[PDB]
Design an enzyme around this catalytic site. Structure first.
Site, PDB file in Angstrom:
ATOM      1  N   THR A 180       8.322   3.559 -10.653  1.00 51.19           N
ATOM      2  CA  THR A 180       7.522   2.704  -9.969  1.00 51.19           C
ATOM      3  C   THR A 180       8.100   1.146  -9.959  1.00 51.19           C
ATOM      4  N   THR A 213      -4.281  -4.034  -4.138  1.00 51.23           N
ATOM      5  CA  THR A 213      -5.308  -3.616  -5.013  1.00 51.23           C
ATOM      6  C   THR A 213      -4.760  -2.482  -5.562  1.00 51.23           C
ATOM      7  N   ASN A 248       0.936  -1.226  -0.045  1.00 52.07           N
ATOM      8  CA  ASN A 248      -0.077  -0.112   0.117  1.00 52.07           C
ATOM      9  C   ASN A 248       0.941   1.142  -0.021  1.00 52.07           C
ATOM     10  N   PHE A 249       0.172   2.251  -0.307  1.00 52.33           N
ATOM     11  CA  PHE A 249       0.950   3.549  -0.239  1.00 52.33           C
ATOM     12  C   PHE A 249       2.074   3.916  -1.100  1.00 52.33           C
ATOM     13  N   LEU A 250       1.959   3.442  -2.285  1.00 47.96           N
ATOM     14  CA  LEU A 250       2.971   3.573  -3.504  1.00 47.96           C
ATOM     15  C   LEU A 250       2.571   4.835  -3.816  1.00 47.96           C
ATOM     16  N   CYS A 251       3.563   5.884  -3.706  1.00 52.46           N
ATOM     17  CA  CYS A 251       3.453   7.195  -4.028  1.00 52.46           C
ATOM     18  C   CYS A 251       4.777   7.838  -4.566  1.00 52.46           C
ATOM     19  N   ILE A 252       4.556   8.565  -5.758  1.00 51.56           N
ATOM     20  CA  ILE A 252       5.494   9.381  -6.320  1.00 51.56           C
ATOM     21  C   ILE A 252       5.120  10.739  -6.494  1.00 51.56           C
ATOM     22  N   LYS A 302       8.700   8.794 -15.032  1.00 50.17           N
ATOM     23  CA  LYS A 302      10.429   8.470 -15.134  1.00 50.17           C
ATOM     24  C   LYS A 302      10.561   7.009 -15.066  1.00 50.17           C
ATOM     25  N   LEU A 357      -7.134  -1.110   2.874  1.00 55.61           N
ATOM     26  CA  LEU A 357      -7.250   0.148   3.262  1.00 55.61           C
ATOM     27  C   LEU A 357      -6.727   1.024   2.175  1.00 55.61           C
TER      28      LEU A 357
HETATM   29  C1  LIG Z   1       6.736 -10.561  -2.158  1.00 49.20           C
HETATM   30  C2  LIG Z   1       7.099  -9.077  -2.342  1.00 49.20           C
HETATM   31  C3  LIG Z   1       6.100  -8.290  -3.613  1.00 49.20           C
HETATM   32  C4  LIG Z   1       6.204  -7.112  -3.124  1.00 49.20           C
HETATM   33  C5  LIG Z   1       5.511  -6.342  -4.318  1.00 49.20           C
HETATM   34  C6  LIG Z   1       4.557  -6.801  -4.901  1.00 49.20           C
HETATM   35  C7  LIG Z   1       4.072  -5.939  -6.259  1.00 49.20           C
HETATM   36  C8  LIG Z   1       3.326  -4.664  -5.532  1.00 49.20           C
HETATM   37  C9  LIG Z   1       2.687  -3.777  -6.633  1.00 49.20           C
HETATM   38  C10 LIG Z   1       2.474  -2.479  -6.110  1.00 49.20           C
HETATM   39  C11 LIG Z   1       0.976  -2.051  -5.752  1.00 49.20           C
HETATM   40  C12 LIG Z   1       0.703  -0.628  -5.470  1.00 49.20           C
HETATM   41  C13 LIG Z   1      -0.748  -0.690  -4.484  1.00 49.20           C
HETATM   42  C14 LIG Z   1      -0.982   0.816  -4.369  1.00 49.20           C
HETATM   43  O1  LIG Z   1      -0.507   1.494  -3.387  1.00 49.20           O
HETATM   44  S1  LIG Z   1      -2.091   1.457  -5.385  1.00 49.20           S
HETATM   45  C15 LIG Z   1      -1.796   3.060  -5.005  1.00 49.20           C
HETATM   46  C16 LIG Z   1      -1.003   3.799  -6.225  1.00 49.20           C
HETATM   47  N1  LIG Z   1      -0.809   5.148  -5.937  1.00 49.20           N
HETATM   48  C17 LIG Z   1      -1.509   6.189  -6.564  1.00 49.20           C
HETATM   49  O2  LIG Z   1      -2.397   6.136  -7.448  1.00 49.20           O
HETATM   50  C18 LIG Z   1      -1.226   7.576  -6.179  1.00 49.20           C
HETATM   51  C19 LIG Z   1      -1.138   8.869  -7.167  1.00 49.20           C
HETATM   52  N2  LIG Z   1      -0.154   8.325  -8.276  1.00 49.20           N
HETATM   53  C20 LIG Z   1       1.067   8.117  -8.219  1.00 49.20           C
HETATM   54  O3  LIG Z   1       1.849   8.334  -7.337  1.00 49.20           O
HETATM   55  C21 LIG Z   1       1.750   7.550  -9.553  1.00 49.20           C
HETATM   56  O4  LIG Z   1       1.039   7.878 -10.575  1.00 49.20           O
HETATM   57  C22 LIG Z   1       2.286   5.837  -9.374  1.00 49.20           C
HETATM   58  C23 LIG Z   1       3.328   5.817  -8.393  1.00 49.20           C
HETATM   59  C24 LIG Z   1       0.865   5.338  -9.043  1.00 49.20           C
HETATM   60  C25 LIG Z   1       2.613   5.516 -10.664  1.00 49.20           C
HETATM   61  O5  LIG Z   1       4.082   6.145 -11.052  1.00 49.20           O
HETATM   62  P1  LIG Z   1       4.114   6.853 -12.591  1.00 49.20           P
HETATM   63  O6  LIG Z   1       2.734   7.377 -12.946  1.00 49.20           O
HETATM   64  O7  LIG Z   1       5.302   7.959 -12.343  1.00 49.20           O
HETATM   65  O8  LIG Z   1       4.697   5.642 -13.248  1.00 49.20           O
HETATM   66  P2  LIG Z   1       6.204   5.300 -13.565  1.00 49.20           P
HETATM   67  O9  LIG Z   1       6.860   6.037 -14.736  1.00 49.20           O
HETATM   68  O10 LIG Z   1       7.168   5.190 -12.328  1.00 49.20           O
HETATM   69  O11 LIG Z   1       6.097   3.724 -14.114  1.00 49.20           O
HETATM   70  C26 LIG Z   1       5.235   3.144 -14.977  1.00 49.20           C
HETATM   71  C27 LIG Z   1       4.766   1.850 -14.664  1.00 49.20           C
HETATM   72  O12 LIG Z   1       3.978   1.730 -13.306  1.00 49.20           O
HETATM   73  C28 LIG Z   1       2.999   0.817 -13.467  1.00 49.20           C
HETATM   74  N3  LIG Z   1       1.886   1.184 -12.700  1.00 49.20           N
HETATM   75  C29 LIG Z   1       1.175   2.324 -12.674  1.00 49.20           C
HETATM   76  N4  LIG Z   1       0.350   2.224 -11.525  1.00 49.20           N
HETATM   77  C30 LIG Z   1       0.673   1.259 -10.810  1.00 49.20           C
HETATM   78  C31 LIG Z   1      -0.123   0.933  -9.586  1.00 49.20           C
HETATM   79  N5  LIG Z   1      -1.172   1.550  -9.165  1.00 49.20           N
HETATM   80  N6  LIG Z   1       0.382  -0.386  -9.098  1.00 49.20           N
HETATM   81  C32 LIG Z   1       1.520  -1.040  -9.591  1.00 49.20           C
HETATM   82  N7  LIG Z   1       1.845  -0.570 -10.754  1.00 49.20           N
HETATM   83  C33 LIG Z   1       1.368   0.504 -11.371  1.00 49.20           C
HETATM   84  C34 LIG Z   1       2.536   0.875 -14.769  1.00 49.20           C
HETATM   85  O13 LIG Z   1       2.011  -0.551 -15.130  1.00 49.20           O
HETATM   86  C35 LIG Z   1       3.667   1.384 -15.553  1.00 49.20           C
HETATM   87  O14 LIG Z   1       4.083   0.029 -15.992  1.00 49.20           O
HETATM   88  P3  LIG Z   1       4.474  -0.548 -17.619  1.00 49.20           P
HETATM   89  O15 LIG Z   1       3.457   0.650 -18.333  1.00 49.20           O
HETATM   90  O16 LIG Z   1       6.026  -0.240 -17.696  1.00 49.20           O
HETATM   91  O17 LIG Z   1       4.118  -1.884 -17.699  1.00 49.20           O
HETATM   92  C1  LIG Z   2     -16.512   9.448  -4.179  1.00 53.12           C
HETATM   93  C2  LIG Z   2     -14.940   9.613  -3.918  1.00 53.12           C
HETATM   94  C3  LIG Z   2     -14.620  10.327  -2.625  1.00 53.12           C
HETATM   95  C4  LIG Z   2     -13.407  10.631  -2.394  1.00 53.12           C
HETATM   96  N1  LIG Z   2     -12.504  10.126  -3.204  1.00 53.12           N
HETATM   97  C5  LIG Z   2     -12.457   9.582  -4.372  1.00 53.12           C
HETATM   98  C6  LIG Z   2     -11.627   9.031  -5.511  1.00 53.12           C
HETATM   99  C7  LIG Z   2     -14.233   9.253  -4.820  1.00 53.12           C
HETATM  100  C8  LIG Z   2     -14.271   8.478  -5.826  1.00 53.12           C
HETATM  101  O1  LIG Z   2     -14.591   7.080  -5.943  1.00 53.12           O
HETATM  102  C9  LIG Z   2     -13.397   6.449  -6.080  1.00 53.12           C
HETATM  103  C10 LIG Z   2     -12.628   6.317  -7.042  1.00 53.12           C
HETATM  104 CL1  LIG Z   2     -13.029   6.922  -8.479  1.00 53.12          CL
HETATM  105  C11 LIG Z   2     -11.399   5.599  -6.921  1.00 53.12           C
HETATM  106  C12 LIG Z   2     -10.835   5.043  -5.689  1.00 53.12           C
HETATM  107  C13 LIG Z   2      -9.452   4.366  -5.989  1.00 53.12           C
HETATM  108  C14 LIG Z   2      -8.848   4.194  -7.097  1.00 53.12           C
HETATM  109  C15 LIG Z   2      -7.555   3.677  -7.153  1.00 53.12           C
HETATM  110  N2  LIG Z   2      -7.142   3.220  -6.061  1.00 53.12           N
HETATM  111  C16 LIG Z   2      -7.641   3.352  -4.616  1.00 53.12           C
HETATM  112  N3  LIG Z   2      -6.855   2.840  -4.005  1.00 53.12           N
HETATM  113  C17 LIG Z   2      -7.525   3.091  -2.160  1.00 53.12           C
HETATM  114  C18 LIG Z   2      -7.628   1.740  -1.538  1.00 53.12           C
HETATM  115  N4  LIG Z   2      -6.095   1.320  -1.618  1.00 53.12           N
HETATM  116  C19 LIG Z   2      -5.812   0.896  -3.337  1.00 53.12           C
HETATM  117  C20 LIG Z   2      -5.601   2.528  -3.921  1.00 53.12           C
HETATM  118  C21 LIG Z   2      -8.933   3.858  -4.377  1.00 53.12           C
HETATM  119  C22 LIG Z   2     -11.606   5.170  -4.635  1.00 53.12           C
HETATM  120  C23 LIG Z   2     -12.688   5.742  -4.798  1.00 53.12           C
HETATM  121 CL2  LIG Z   2     -13.772   6.031  -3.293  1.00 53.12          CL
END
Ligand SMILES: CCCCCCCCCCCCCC(=O)SCCNC(=O)CCNC(=O)[C@H](O)C(C)(C)COP(=O)(O)OP(=O)(O)OC[C@H]1O[C@@H](n2cnc3c(N)ncnc32)[C@H](O)[C@@H]1OP(=O)(O)O
Ligand SMILES: Cc1ccnc(C)c1COc1c(Cl)cc(-c2ccnc(N3CCNCC3)c2)cc1Cl
Length: 392
Positions: free
Chosen positions: A127, A149, A113-117, A124, A392
């Site tokens: 991830t 998730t 959880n909490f993957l954030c850039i 770049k 969560l």
């Molecule tokens: C046994 C141990 C195992 C441990 C690890 C198990 C696996 C854990 C996996 C992680 C589970 C996370 C669970 C959560 O926390 S899900 C929460 C994700 N966080 C957010 O959405 C917060 C706002 N967004 C961001 O911070 C950035 O957009 C993130 C960091 C999401 C992407 O950064 P950016 O936009 O700068 O991208 P890049 O240039 O570095 O990289 C591009 C690549 O990244 C892949 N990508 C994009 N989104 C996700 C995503 N949500 N899960 C996995 N991969 C993802 C995508 O396929 C692409 O790959 P490809 O196009 O080359 O194929």
């Molecule tokens: C109604 C509302 C209230 C506050 N924030 C959002 C984004 C919404 C919109 O519905 C969504 C939408 Cl569109 C997307 C999400 C969402 C999407 C991608 N990841 C998540 N995560 C939260 C749970 N762990 C994995 C990452 C939530 C969660 C909600 Cl609750």
């Protein structure tokens, strides 16, 4: 199914891979309040937004303390990246350990959880580098599978669920742009639609107390075993994830209620919900959406294997949950189509969301699992029994 590959412990590298120039790895110590703050600063301005850039998740410091320091937690799994010169925290990825059941096989995993850039370092390819480093850190500790998730589709999801939203304070959700006015109707008629009772209706319903731990643990496990994919709770995890601690937790995050039988005084049901605000991004009238999310719940009536009987008891339990959430000043109550939730979402007036949550297993293969919806992505009573873990 089963594991995809066996990891050689002797080939797991002692040192991490190289990072973009100017940056370096850092283990976060979230018992240190300044580092917990640093993490809160990153997530508050750079974490999950909806596709319209209207809401951002606003995990509170108290939530994060709770979510990231659960039983078995290791600081080695709270991973940061800092700018070498300013020392500023620009990225994160975290895990905590738990055990899951995947079709009656029990698995030791980490929940990621909490993957954030930081927005300025996006696109770049950072991830994969984050993912690979937390992987290595887990491998060193004898963990080789993970569960997570995401809102986006990646290779081979195990299931998928839709978000639903039951408005507790409709007008505020109207002013922030979340809820529509549809379409030959009135603010008053919408408030009327959504208005809830002022007292609960379930006989014997009270707040969970520490003494209920053992009995709730047993009921929860029994119920959760009706799902192909579930969290295999320990006693310590029931304590940590379900029992709020007034004296040590200043801002309450978890809410749990039990049903003590008025006649036998055995606990026959319980439900729970947690506090997770969203920042309303560009809005005059409002700053903040206060959301409650449905969490774990269980009911003895599920073992009668009468789907109509279960619907009845859940319709009553869940409507009390709404009433209690409203009383605690929550604006909206959020649920997914997992558990037996399709039995009550629509009937209790949750409106279908655009959000979708996809579920993934790392290094473990299994057949897809039903997510409570059908091929139109709408709730379906024949498509449950699949997802029994809430993340969560
Ligand atoms: C046994 C141990 C195992 C441990 C690890 C198990 C696996 C854990 C996996 C992680 C589970 C996370 C669970 C959560 O926390 S899900 C929460 C994700 N966080 C957010 O959405 C917060 C706002 N967004 C961001 O911070 C950035 O957009 C993130 C960091 C999401 C992407 O950064 P950016 O936009 O700068 O991208 P890049 O240039 O570095 O990289 C591009 C690549 O990244 C892949 N990508 C994009 N989104 C996700 C995503 N949500 N899960 C996995 N991969 C993802 C995508 O396929 C692409 O790959 P490809 O196009 O080359 O194929
Ligand atoms: C109604 C509302 C209230 C506050 N924030 C959002 C984004 C919404 C919109 O519905 C969504 C939408 Cl569109 C997307 C999400 C969402 C999407 C991608 N990841 C998540 N995560 C939260 C749970 N762990 C994995 C990452 C939530 C969660 C909600 Cl609750």
């Amino acid at each position: 199914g089963g594991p995809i590959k066996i990891i050689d412990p002797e080939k797991v590298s002692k040192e991490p891979d190289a990072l973009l120039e100017g940056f370096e790895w850092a283990t976060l110590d979230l018992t240190n309040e300044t580092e917990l703050q640093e993490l809160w600063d990153l997530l508050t301005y750079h974490y999950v937004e909806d596709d319209n850039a209207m809401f951002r998740f606003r995990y509170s410091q108290s939530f994060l303390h709770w979510a990231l320091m659960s039983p078995g937690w290791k600081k080695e799994w709270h991973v940061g990246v800092r700018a070498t010169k300013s020392r500023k925290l620009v990225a994160s990825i975290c895990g905590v350990p738990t055990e899951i059941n995947v079709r009656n096989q029990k698995l030791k995993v980490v929940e990621i959880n909490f993957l954030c850039i930081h927005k300025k370092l996006r696109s770049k390819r950072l991830t994969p580098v984050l993912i690979k480093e937390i992987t290595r850190r887990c491998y060193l500790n004898g963990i080789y599978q993970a569960i997570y998730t995401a809102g986006v589709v990646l290779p081979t999801p195990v299931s998928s669920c839709r978000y639903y939203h039951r408005p507790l304070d409709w007008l505020k959700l109207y002013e922030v742009g979340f809820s529509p006015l549809p379409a030959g109707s009135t603010k008053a008629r919408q408030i009327t639609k959504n208005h809830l009772p002022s007292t609960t209706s379930t006989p014997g319903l009270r707040p969970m107390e520490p003494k209920d731990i053992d009995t709730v643990h047993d009921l929860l496990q029994r119920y959760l075993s009706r799902f192909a994919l579930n969290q295999a709770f320990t006693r310590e995890e029931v304590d940590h994830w379900l029992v709020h601690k007034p004296e040590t937790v200043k801002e309450q995050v978890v809410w749990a209620y039990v049903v003590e039988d008025p006649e036998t005084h055995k606990i026959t049901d319980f439900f729970s919900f947690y506090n997770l605000e969203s920042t309303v991004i560009q809005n005059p009238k409002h700053d903040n959406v206060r959301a409650a999310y449905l969490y774990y719940y269980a009911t003895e009536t599920a073992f009668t294997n009468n789907m109509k009987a279960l619907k009845e008891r859940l319709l009553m339990l869940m409507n009390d949950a709404l009433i209690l959430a409203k009383k605690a000043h929550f604006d909206v109550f959020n649920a997914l189509t997992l558990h037996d939730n399709p039995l009550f979402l629509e009937q209790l007036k949750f409106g279908a969301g655009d959000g979708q949550l996809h579920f993934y297993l790392y290094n473990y293969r299994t057949a897809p699992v039903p997510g409570g919806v059908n091929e139109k992505n709408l709730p379906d009573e024949k498509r449950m029994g699949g997802v029994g873990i809430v993340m969560l």
